[PDB]
């Protein structure tokens, strides 16, 4: 862990375009707009209204080190993510086919690149049937 706690702080202030310990919330909207995102101001604000536990707007990784310090793979995030499929559960069994799954991954919320969605289920449709078992995908993402 000690091998990234340092090179991470450099990118930490990389948003402020300076050496201030400032996440640069008003300037992250330009950082991303230059990355190719161009979000709205409400989304920009909600990005940090909770990602940063401090509450200021520019922080010295009180949580910018905590967000990174959250494996995002433990059991606390394997059930919350498994319930989302259960929204799409019907007759259970992790039945989902590539058909409904592509229908959905490319229509709702934050859609993917057609090449992203096509090869995303590719690793989860190894058997080639129309049942993309969830346990097959989380095990793939369990290292998140």
């Amino acid at each position: 862990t000690e091998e990234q706690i340092a090179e991470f702080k450099e990118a930490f202030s990389l948003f402020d375009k300076d050496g201030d310990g400032t996440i640069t919330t008003k300037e992250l909207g330009t950082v991303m707009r230059s990355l190719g995102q161009n979000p709205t101001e409400a989304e920009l604000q909600d990005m940090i209204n909770e990602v940063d536990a401090d509450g200021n707007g520019t922080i010295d990784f009180p949580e910018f080190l905590t967000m990174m310090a959250r494996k995002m793979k433990d059991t606390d995030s394997e059930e919350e993510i498994r319930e989302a499929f259960r929204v799409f559960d019907k007759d259970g069994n992790g039945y989902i086919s590539a058909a409904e799954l592509r229908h959905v991954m490319t229509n709702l919320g934050e859609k993917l690149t057609d090449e992203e969605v096509d090869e995303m289920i590719r690793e989860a449709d190894i058997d080639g049937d129309g049942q993309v078992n969830y346990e097959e995908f989380v095990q793939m993402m369990t290292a998140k």
């Binding site: 995002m72 919350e80 919320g109 992203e116």
Partner: protein
Amino acid sequence: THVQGRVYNFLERPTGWKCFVYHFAVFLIVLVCLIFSVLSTIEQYAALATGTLFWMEIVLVVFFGTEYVVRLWSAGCRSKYVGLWGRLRFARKPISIIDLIVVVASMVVLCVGSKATSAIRGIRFLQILRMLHVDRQGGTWRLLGSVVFIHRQELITTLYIGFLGLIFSSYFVYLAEKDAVNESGRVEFGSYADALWWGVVTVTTIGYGDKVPQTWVGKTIASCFSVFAISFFALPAGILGSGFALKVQQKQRQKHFNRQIPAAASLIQTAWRCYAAENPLREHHRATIKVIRRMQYFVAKKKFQQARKPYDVRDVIEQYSQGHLNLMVR
């Protein structure tokens, strides 16, 4: 041509405050034009009114004509109605055809009538028939019809029973009061029809007082009746009210889950990204896209969780029943 659906749902699926006051304003216009149709039938004021109802009428007819044509054009955003055949499938619907005949018949009357009895005799019914134009989609009537169809049996029942009570008690009254003569010298109950009018007026708690019985028999029966039958003409109120309420709740519930879905989708749609942070200063662009992926994910997780909470009791029990099941596997 993004404006097409924009004005459409400004006109046909309204929500907010702007479109609101629009519909509201047009409603008030309609209502005052009516309240002048009112004061038209009063001879004191039947002159100025019928006058200004020749200008205001033209105002409204042209207003509506344009609003209609523009609505129709803006009905393409909805594919079902795109293309001439779809368009026709549009005006085929009730409220639209109503607006159509309103506007065209106003035009008729004002194309011939202007060169006055039949005119105004029709204009009044138009000013009345227009009020339909506000409920742009009919949720009102649909609510009603559903609630009824549900409770059809109760309603039929109480109707049948009240009907019979009416019939019988009225016949008996007729028999008991047909001779009697009012103190004003006249006779109230000459026929069964009159008795039956009495019954209607009575059992539903109006009581004008134009027909009242005099004999001890009639009063006896009317009392018993009045006590033991009025209730069958007053249930529908409670029924329908409860139905309305229940249904609205049922709906907004469903709406809760329809809200639930998008978040479930976005969560994963962001997870796969942040996770898949290796295969979409180029490297700094990469770092930043990764960071935002991560943040967004952290956002979704919370939003989903908050949008999966137990609206009600059935929800909790389903959830934890399901946990139990998961044990049934374990």
